Amino acid sequence: DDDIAALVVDNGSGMCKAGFAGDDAPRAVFPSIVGRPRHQGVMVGMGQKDSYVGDEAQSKRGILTLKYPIEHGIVTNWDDMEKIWHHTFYNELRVAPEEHPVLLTEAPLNPKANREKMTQIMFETFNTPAMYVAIQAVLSLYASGRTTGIVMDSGDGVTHTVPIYEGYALPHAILRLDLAGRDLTDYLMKILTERGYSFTTTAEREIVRDIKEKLCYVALDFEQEMATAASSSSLEKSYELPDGQVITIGNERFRCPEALFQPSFLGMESCGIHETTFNSIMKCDVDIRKDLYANTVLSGGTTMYPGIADRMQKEITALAPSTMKIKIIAPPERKYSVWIGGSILASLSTFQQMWISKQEYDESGPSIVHRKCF
Amino acid sequence: AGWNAYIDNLMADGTCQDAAIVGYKDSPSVWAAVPGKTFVNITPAEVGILVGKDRSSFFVNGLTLGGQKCSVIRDSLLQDGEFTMDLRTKSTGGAPTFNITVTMTAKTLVLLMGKEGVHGGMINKKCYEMASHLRRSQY
Numbered sequence: 121d122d123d124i125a126a127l128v129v130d131n132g133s134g135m136c137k138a139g140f141a142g143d144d145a146p147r148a149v150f151p152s153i154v155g156r157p158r159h160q161g162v163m164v165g166m167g168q169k170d171s172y173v174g175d176e177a178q179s180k181r182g183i184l185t186l187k188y189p190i191e192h193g194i195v196t197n198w199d200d201m202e203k204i205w206h207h208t209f210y211n212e213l214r215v216a217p218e219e220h221p222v223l224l225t226e227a228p229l230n231p232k233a234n235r236e237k238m239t240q241i242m243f244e245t246f247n248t249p250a251m252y253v254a255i256q257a258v259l260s261l262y263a264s265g266r267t268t269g270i271v272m273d274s275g276d277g278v279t280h281t282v283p284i285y286e287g288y289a290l291p292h293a294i295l296r297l298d299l300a301g302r303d304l305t306d307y308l309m310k311i312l313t314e315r316g317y318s319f320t321t322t323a324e325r326e327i328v329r330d331i332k333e334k335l336c337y338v339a340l341d342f343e344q345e346m347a348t349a350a351s352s353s354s355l356e357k358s359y360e361l362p363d364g365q366v367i368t369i370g371n372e373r374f375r376c377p378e379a380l381f382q383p384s385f386l387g388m389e390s391c392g393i394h395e396t397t398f399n400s401i402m403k404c405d406v407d408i409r410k411d412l413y414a415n416t417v418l419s420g421g422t423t424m425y426p427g428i429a430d431r432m433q434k435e436i437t438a439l440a441p442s443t444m445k446i447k448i449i450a451p452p453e454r455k456y457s458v459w460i461g462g463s464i465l466a467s468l469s470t471f472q473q474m475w476i477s478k479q480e481y482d483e484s485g486p487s488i489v490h491r492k493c494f
Numbered sequence: 495a496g497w498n499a500y501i502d503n504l505m506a507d508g509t510c511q512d513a514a515i516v517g518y519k520d521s522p523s524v525w526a527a528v529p530g531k532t533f534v535n536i537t538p539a540e541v542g543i544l545v546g547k548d549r550s551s552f553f554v555n556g557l558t559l560g561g562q563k564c565s566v567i568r569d570s571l572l573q574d575g576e577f578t579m580d581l582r583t584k585s586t587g588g589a590p591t592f593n594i595t596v597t598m599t600a601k602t603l604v605l606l607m608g609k610e611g612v613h614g615g616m617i618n619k620k621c622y623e624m625a626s627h628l629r630r631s632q633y
């Protein structure tokens with residue numbers, strides 16, 4: 121009951137969500153950036169603070185230089201990830217690390233030495249009673265109330281299709297696609313600027329993020345949808361600049377998420393998202409495939425587009441053997457699946473016999489993460 | 495009593511339901527196994543699969559251990575300083591399934607099956623600590 125409860129920390133490329141096990145939603149969701157002034161700064165209503173972290177650095181992003189620790193799901197910068205975590209405990213949840221076990225999540229296929237460095241930091245640097253590292257797609261599955269299935273996880277920096285047999289991700293059949301939400305904010309701004317629009321001032325580079333999230337749609341049939349842009353009337357919608365000015369968006373709204381299905385739109389040779397779910401399924405055990413088609417779960421902010429469940433269904437139904445029951449699952453709380461799957465898991469009395477304890481870390485060293493976290 | 499001290503050891507704390515030591519060298523041969531359970535029955539063919547040069551078709555096709563069918567979850571059996579392959583058992587007719595780790599030491603293959611509800615990591619960690627004690631023995 122609150123003070124004592126593990127803290128679930130979900131470490132996303134664009135966003136971090138952190139809270140307490142047994143809770144329904146993340147208590148702190150924040151931007152995954154560290155921003156240092158690159159000109160000796162400090163407001164005189166703060167210490168000589170030259171790294172702002174999370175959202176208090178979003179609102180000075182324009183005056184600051186921002187480093188992204190997590191990248192395509194993997195941590196590229198270890199002291200700036202250390203900063204983020206210190207801010208998670210000591211400023212966002214207002215917690216003490218040495219009294220709470222932590223469940224940290226991690227990327228499917230996360231490099232060996234990364235798993236060990238986050239075991240390392242957490243134990244030696246934050247003196248954690250215990251910890252566990254779960255793959256993100258597997259907590260998306262548990263939170264839908266399922267144990268076998270394949271999750272299609274699309275965040276800001278990566279997409280993976282993960283087949284899971286009985287709570288265990290099958291690493292050989294995991295496939296990674298480096299095209300997710302940022303790729304789609306970027307491509308939206310270029311097709312909007314191609315229409316002679318002007319997103320010239322800093323804040324307003326972040327104003328394409330809201331058009332993208334507010335007006336984009338996934339088309340069932342891109343082709344009959346494009347001529348159901350030329351039979352206009354109802355497709356153009358408008359967006360208002362801070363500047364007072366107006367935007368009008370039409371074929372762009374559905375042409376943006378389409379780069380997920382056809383990454384040729386982006387200039388990428390990659391298969392789209394519908395083929396990658398199908399190619400992980402083909403790499404799995406012959407006797408669980410029928411289970412993986414019946415349990416295709418989508419999770420992550422980039423899966424929030426209207427039409428994506430239907431269009432994912434339509435498309436997997438075309439590649440799949442002519443009989444498979446294909447059940448695409450798209451729980452309405454799926455921007456937060458990885459965090460509430462971990463909150464469930466780290467609250468079961470089941471889980472306390474599943475952590476790596478301070479004792480064990482001493483006993484073994486950092487290597488033990490490979491043994492116990494699968 | 496010999497290799498049996500390892501297996502009665504593995505079994506000591508009521509998390510496993512089976513254990514076995516298998517010389518994979520020359521003709522594979524079980525050297526100690528929990529009597530009358532599955533691994534007492536492992537065979538050369540299946541050993542050949544566990545230590546096979548083809549490290550991939552066991553992912554689609556599956557493998558049997560005893561006559562028990564099993565999905566391969568991780569395989570880092572032949573990989574240095576890893577030595578483990580982790581497996582889960584396939585069911586029919588609703589029966590429970592079970593995690594398995596196999597650890598290759600210099601000569602031995604130590605396998606150990608969890609009871610229902612025990613998590614793949616307890617097994618991996620336990621079967622690996624036991625096997626360490628084979629590898630630091632020229633076994």
Ligand SMILES: Nc1ncnc2c1ncn2[C@@H]1O[C@H](COP(=O)(O)OP(=O)(O)OP(=O)(O)O)[C@@H](O)[C@H]1O
Nearest residue numbers: 132133134135275276277278301333420421422424
């Ligand atoms: N309604 C929406 N439509 C489209 N995209 C959305 C919507 N809501 C959020 N997003 C996008 O989802 C992304 C954030 O999702 P998410 O929290 O899953 O990613 P992340 O965890 O930070 O990244 P990663 O998996 O790469 O680690 C952002 O790019 C955001 O623009």
Ligand SMILES: [Sr+2]
Nearest residue numbers: 132256275458
């Ligand atoms: Sr994520």
